[PDB]
Amino acid sequence: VPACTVSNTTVDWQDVENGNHEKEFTVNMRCPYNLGTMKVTITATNTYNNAILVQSSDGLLVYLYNSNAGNIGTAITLGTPFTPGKITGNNADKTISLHAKLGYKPFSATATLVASYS
Amino acid sequence: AVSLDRTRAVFDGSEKSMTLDISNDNKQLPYLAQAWIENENQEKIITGPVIATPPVQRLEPGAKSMVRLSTTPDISKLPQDRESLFYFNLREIPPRSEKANVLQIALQTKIKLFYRPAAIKTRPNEVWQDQLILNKVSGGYRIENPTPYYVTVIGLGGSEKQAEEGEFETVMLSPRSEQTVKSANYNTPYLSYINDYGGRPVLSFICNGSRCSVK
């Protein structure tokens, strides 16, 4: 069966001068009809204090939290697989609610959502 | 949105290569598709015995393409009486957002790539997973896979529905190996696994005392 697909997703910030300005963003994966509980992993090229290190060894920090019913919940350990705490819909049209704080140690950081299939 | 046609790949050892279909289903934007192989332990390998071609490619909106898996000479040094596990990875590089102060989310698909040597070549719809053996032990069951293939188990329970849906720690048993799993004791255990094409069949087990097998 075809692998899940993820439609382009990007979270925004207008300007803000361990985590400032909680934020809600969703990622909806369209998956196989029989996918089970599979957990995903979020990684980045460079990290620090469990945050994504944007763009010599210093930069901006982006923290990620597993959304909890609109309420910010447990943080996301980068590089560790996790079973989402905010999943809505069917396999054919899933959704993961997450939170993204901010910090520091025109930026366009990238975070890899790893779907490893059993 | 870069998509891959399968959740696992089986490489027929009696073949020199095989292709994987991929596609960018985004209507307006072009995507980059990175492809590469990792070893048994998920470490990237660039010189065989299994290689991914091409390493990087662009897919214009709605475009379709492929990724070729081919083996090198050293592929022969792998056992020919069992499968060797590799991983196929496909990562998308989304068009750089023209926006500012933005965090891009990219998808990386990692699937199991089973190198299955010719001597153990399978036929379509062939089932070997029914050869598993469940041995009751403290905690749960020691599961035995006497076959030459990797077997991924995703469910185990007292009823067929309990095996399909029910908190279970997915486990993959290597060829000719066994592992123990935490589970409640069931008089009629049902095990669910994943076949070559992603289907999820449920097996019915009959326990003769401590040992349970499929009729």
Curated annotation (Swiss-Prot), chain A:
Further remarks about this protein from its record: Strains of E.coli that cause infection of the human urinary tract produce pap-pili (P pili) which are hair-like appendages consisting of about 1000 helically arranged subunits of the protein PapA. These pili mediate binding to digalactoside-containing glycolipids present on the epithelial cells which line the urinary tract.
Biological source species: Escherichia coli
Function: Repeated PapE subunits make up the thin (2 nm in diameter) tip fibrillum of the P pilus. Subunits are arranged in a open helical conformation. Pili with a defective papE gene have low adhesive capacity or none; however, the binding property of the whole cell is not affected. Pili are polar filaments radiating from the surface of the bacterium to a length of 0.5-1.5 micrometers and numbering 100-300 per cell, and enable bacteria to colonize the epithelium of specific host organs.
Modifications the protein undergoes after translation, according to the UniProt entry: Overexpression of this protein in the absence of chaperone PapD leads to proteolysis of itself and CpxP; degradation requires both cpxP and degP, as well as the N-terminus of PapE.
Any one annotated GO CC term: extracellular region
Keywords from the UniProt entry: Cell adhesion, Fimbrium, Secreted, Signal
A GO biological-process term: cell adhesion involved in single-species biofilm formation
Biological classification of the source: Bacteria, Pseudomonadati, Pseudomonadota, Gammaproteobacteria, Enterobacterales
UniProt subcellular location: Secreted; Fimbrium
Subunit composition and interactions: Probably interacts with chaperone PapD. Assembly of the P pilus requires periplasmic chaperone PapD, in absence of the chaperone overexpression of this subunit is toxic, with PapE accumulating in the periplasm. Misfolded protein interacts with CpxP, which probably targets it for degradation.
Protein's name in the database: Fimbrial protein PapE
Curated annotation (Swiss-Prot), chain B:
Pfam families reported for this sequence: PapD_C, PapD_N
GO-annotated cellular components: outer membrane-bounded periplasmic space
Disulfide bond sites: 207-212
Keyword GTP-binding: no
Keywords for the protein's UniProt record, in alphabetical order: Chaperone, Disulfide bond, Fimbrium biogenesis, Immunoglobulin domain, Periplasm, Signal
Cellular compartment(s): Periplasm
Superkingdom of origin: Bacteria
InterPro entries, per database record: Ig-like_fold, PapD-like_sf, Periplasmic_pilus_chap, Pili_assmbl_chap_C_dom_sf, Pili_assmbl_chaperone_bac, Pili_assmbl_chaperone_C, Pili_assmbl_chaperone_CS, Pili_assmbl_chaperone_N
UniProt cross-references to PROSITE patterns, sorted A to Z: PILI_CHAPERONE (PS00635)
Effect after changing residue 8 to A/G: Loss of chaperone activity, no interaction with PapG, no longer suppresses PapA P pilus subunit toxicity
Annotated GO biological process: cell wall organization; chaperone-mediated protein folding
Note: PapD donates its G1 beta strand to complete the Ig fold of PapK (donor strand complementation).
Role of this protein: Binds and caps interactive surfaces on P pilus subunits to prevent them from participating in non-productive interactions. Facilitates the import of P pilus subunits into the periplasm, probably also facilitates their folding. Chaperone-subunit complexes are then targeted to the PapC outer membrane usher where the chaperone must uncap from the subunits. Coexpression of this chaperone with individual, otherwise toxic, P pilus subunits (tested with PapA, PapE and PapG) suppresses their growth inhibitory phenotype.
UniProt similarity note: Belongs to the periplasmic pilus chaperone family.
Subunit: Interacts with substrates PapG and PapK.
PANTHER family in the record: FIMBRIAL CHAPARONE PROTEIN, PILUS ASSEMBLY CHAPERONE
Name assigned to this protein: Chaperone protein PapD
Gene this chain is encoded by: papD
